Design an enzyme around this catalytic site. Structure first.
Site, PDB file in Angstrom:
ATOM      1  N   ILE A 142     -11.988  23.141  48.129  1.00  0.00           N
ATOM      2  CA  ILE A 142     -11.769  21.733  48.431  1.00  0.00           C
ATOM      3  C   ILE A 142     -13.073  20.975  48.191  1.00  0.00           C
ATOM      4  CG2 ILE A 142     -11.015  20.074  50.178  1.00  0.00           C
ATOM      5  CD1 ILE A 142      -9.413  22.258  51.488  1.00  0.00           C
TER       6      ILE A 142
ATOM      7  N   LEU B 123     -21.064  22.666  45.525  1.00  0.00           N
ATOM      8  CA  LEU B 123     -22.486  23.090  45.635  1.00  0.00           C
ATOM      9  C   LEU B 123     -22.562  24.608  45.309  1.00  0.00           C
ATOM     10  CD1 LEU B 123     -22.346  21.064  48.747  1.00  0.00           C
ATOM     11  CD2 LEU B 123     -21.949  23.538  48.720  1.00  0.00           C
TER      12      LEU B 123
ATOM     13  N   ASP C 298     -20.262  10.515  54.387  1.00  0.00           N
ATOM     14  CA  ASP C 298     -19.895  11.912  54.682  1.00  0.00           C
ATOM     15  C   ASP C 298     -19.647  12.228  56.163  1.00  0.00           C
ATOM     16  OD1 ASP C 298     -22.363  12.757  55.696  1.00  0.00           O
ATOM     17  OD2 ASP C 298     -22.808  13.938  53.890  1.00  0.00           O
TER      18      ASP C 298
END
EC number: 4.1.1.98
Lengths: 460, 437
Positions: free
Chosen positions: B135, B151, B236
């Site tokens: 995700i 990442l 975020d």
């Protein structure tokens, strides 16, 4: 004008419920009121208490709305104006007749067991009077103090007077013993006064005027009083019940244990005895009562409303303060959250020291969290956010040892003495940190306002 | 499947359809944020301004709804997790197809969550690359271009790095699925048999990757080697904007969808948000692993408001003086997931770890701040946490809010007020007839 006016108003607005079932003043009323308070329900009038004819009124001030109404206004915001009044301040009408003196009993005929005095919790020592306005006069001075002390029942005409040392009634008595060795100290207690006189006793009032005078300002009109039958003290004329009598010097008794506002039992301890010579009351009298326990309780809801009064007094001294809040879950006074418009490095520390020193009500406050103005002090979601994203614990926590603490707080290392903790959860400026600080997410005020406008028609 | 799930929720008052026009630009996020913060329902926006496709969000905004999505009435069954797929040929997700020049991602009501976000962002895509599922957030940079923000340590990024080394110059095949059934969505957290029966999948039109058959929409395409773009800034889960940074580009060759397709979306921001409520439900897996090592532990909770991992509350059956300190040290050392946990509060078992009313009660009636607070300096911290003095290094605080025993205190500790069970029962019995409301 009086308490009954207040109750009929509340009843029309769905803020008073009459209960006709038999309910015991021993433990059962407390349980009912606790469930009711915890779901924001109405004030309660028990018309059929098991073994008594006098009805029992409680949960009167169990929402902050009802506190506001009792000072005249519709909403809690208007308490801030009563705040500006208090800053500004650095009259009473005596009647001949009075409803509170319609029925009288004295000497041997005093029987306190005819009143439905509540027993609140299972291990409490005995029935306890909780909403009495105690009226006293010192020897060197004319001013009458009003105080709210709990009073345990120890006989047909004896009560214990639990006033702690710092309070006005205890100070008046201590001086009286010194100025008039051996003489009986005159005392009276009023139950069921009108809401403004009640709320005035609870509020801190500078000596420049009397306690009855303040209550006259919250109410449109002057406070009506009446002289007591057996002493020269003045009590509210529309009181439902009044106790008159004296303290015999050096007469004392063991008090408690009793459950308290912290949610724990106070251990047994000695206080003076109040002998009751006269009980005077109204013709169809109502007994006004309450209870303290694990928060939230009625006192704690009063203390939240009463803290709105203080926001302005603080702001005038520290204009950087946007909001200031003491959650009821922290026993009303032990923890505070403060939000500020920060102007310089280190600013949060001056604000901590201000909370711990400016007003006496916050002298014993153990925990103080300071935040920026993008935080809603009244929402744990924001406060925890700020703590966990704007602090390094060792860098940003302030500890101070050997400071004053309530002598009944068992959690401190020695009685009367303990530490305090301030948490600086503000954004750190250059000098406080060498890192690039994060830019917070701000909402669009136009989108917020549009959604307020369609919120009701969305019907979620 | 997803639509079965939604009709179930609707009959139980757990889904609101909303018919008023509302913008995917900023307005949906504001509405969902207010609803989540008051424990309200999942939301289906039937009329999004400028689009035909309805937008579903706040699906998993209460932990109850997480439980229902795994079959049952309690989140309890995750504690047992603490202790193969079916290929179809044909699928509702492939009823309508578009490709090449006809791919126009601007026809999908992609949300823009916060005012300074660089661009619309896709947030609930299942990215498929053995097959890894991930995700990753995907910023919109063109008609048929998205940025793939994975990442380096994660499964999708590792697959790509190997592909470039093993096949220099070759396009990397990728697919993304939106609106799968609830069990495949919940499945995650380092295959999950919460459903018990096998997951149904379907082969993609333009590559050999397998995606959920009951997907509402699927994106197929590739990553052109060495093609990258600036990503963000975006708001975020910490409540702050991350600064701009470069990631690979995902070129979309095919968009496949269901008829009358629903677009499934969410948002991250200042907690609590939907991801944080998912992480709370999903933490229940570890309670048993902790309890086996420290049987004194009754509950263990990480509030979402603390960005999911930064604060923990632990309740214990205390057995000796100093016990709370061993438990702190345990939280900070036993499992790697709690290595970076900055704040730990320890309480007795008469406290509900999940209720601030109880936790504040304990703190303010059982602590002397200087005696009962533990500070440790120079410990490991997340390198992105800008609040520590130096990147990667900071302090931690434990608060011992347990009742103090002899030795910890020389005072008479308080006896709490307990209620009379007979009085409680009598009042339960007459409660309805009392009629207070």
């Amino acid at each position: 004008n009086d308490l009954r006016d207040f109750l009929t108003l509340l009843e029309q607005q769905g803020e008073l419920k009459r209960i006709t079932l038999p309910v015991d003043p021993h433990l059962e009323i407390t349980e009912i009121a606790d469930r009711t308070l915890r779901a924001g329900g109405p004030a309660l009038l028990f018309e059929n208490p098991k073994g008594y004819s006098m009805p029992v009124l409680c949960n009167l001030f169990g929402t902050p709305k009802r506190v506001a109404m009792g000072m005249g206004q519709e909403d809690v915001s208007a308490l801030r104006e009563v705040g500006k009044l208090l800053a500004f301040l650095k009259p009473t009408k005596r009647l001949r007749g009075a409803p509170c003196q319609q029925k009288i009993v004295s000497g041997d005929d005093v029987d306190l067991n005819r009143i439905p005095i509540m027993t609140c919790w299972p291990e409490d020592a005995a029935p306890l009077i909780t909403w009495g306005l105690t009226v006293t006069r010192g020897p060197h001075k004319e001013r009458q103090n009003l105080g709210i002390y709990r009073q345990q029942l120890i006989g047909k005409n004896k009560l214990i007077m639990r006033w702690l040392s710092h309070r006005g009634g205890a100070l008046d008595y201590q001086e009286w013993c010194a100025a008039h060795p051996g003489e009986r100290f005159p005392v009276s207690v009023a139950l069921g006064a009108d809401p403004a006189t009640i709320l005035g006793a609870v509020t801190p009032v500078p000596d420049t005027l009397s306690e009855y005078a303040f209550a006259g300002l919250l109410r449109g009109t002057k406070t009506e009083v009446v002289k007591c039958i057996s002493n020269d003290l003045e009590v509210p004329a529309s009181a439902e019940i009044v106790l008159e009598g004296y303290i015999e010097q050096g007469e004392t008794a063991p008090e408690g244990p009793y459950g308290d506002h912290t949610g724990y039992y106070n251990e047994v301890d000695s206080f003076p005895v109040f002998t009751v010579t006269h009980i005077t009351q109204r013709e169809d009298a109502i007994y006004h009562s309450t209870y303290t326990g694990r928060p939230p309780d009625e006192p704690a809801v009063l203390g939240v409303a009463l803290n709105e009064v203080f926001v302005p007094i603080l702001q005038k001294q520290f204009p950087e303060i946007v909001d200031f809040y003491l959650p009821p879950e922290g026993c009303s006074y032990r923890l505070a959250v403060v939000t500020i418009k920060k102007q310089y490095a280190g600013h949060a520390k001056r604000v901590m020291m201000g909370v711990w020193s400016f007003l006496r009500q916050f002298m014993y406050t153990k925990f103080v969290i300071v935040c920026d103005d993008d935080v809603n002090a009244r929402d744990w979601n924001d406060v925890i956010w700020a703590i966990t994203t704007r602090m390094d614990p060792a860098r940003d926590t302030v500890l101070v040892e050997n400071t004053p603490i309530d002598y009944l707080d068992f959690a401190s290392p020695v009685s009367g003495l303990g530490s305090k903790m301030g948490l600086d959860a503000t954004n750190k400026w250059p000098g406080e940190t060498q890192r690039e600080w994060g830019r917070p997410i701000k909402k669009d005020p136009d989108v917020v306002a549009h959604i307020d406008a369609i919120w009701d028609e969305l019907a979620i």
